[PDB]
Amino acid sequence: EHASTDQGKTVSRATTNSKTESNTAGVSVNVGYQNGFTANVTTNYSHTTDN
Amino acid sequence: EHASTDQGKTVSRATTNSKTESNTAGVSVNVGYQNGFTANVTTNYSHTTDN
Prior knowledge:
The structure is cut from a larger assembly and holds 2 copies of chain A. By secondary structure, the first copy, chain A, is mostly loops. In chain A, about 10% of the residues lie in helices and about 0% in strands. The interface between A and B is small, with 4 and 6 residues. It is classed as toxin. The entry lists the keywords Translocase, binary toxin, toxin.
C-alpha cells in the first residue's frame, strides 16, 4: 500500500483503450432487417468519455 | 537391635554481588499515509549497567 518497491510485489502490463467498445458491446446481430431499418440498437449508449 | 536418633541444626549466610552490562541496537522502518505518503527510519542504540 505505502511506498512499495522495497516493500512487496508488483505486476505491470501495457494496455490499449477504446472510446466506443463499451457502446458496441450491446449489439446483437439478428441477421434479419425488418422494414429498411438497416441498423442496430445498443442496450446502453455511452459517449466517447467512457474508455 | 540398634536404634538411633539424630537431630541437627544449620545456620547459613550468603552474599552476592552482581554486575551486568547490556548493549542494544535496532532499526525501525515506518511507511504510511497521513495527508500524503510518509516514511521514517529510526536507528537507536542503548547501554545499560546495573549493580
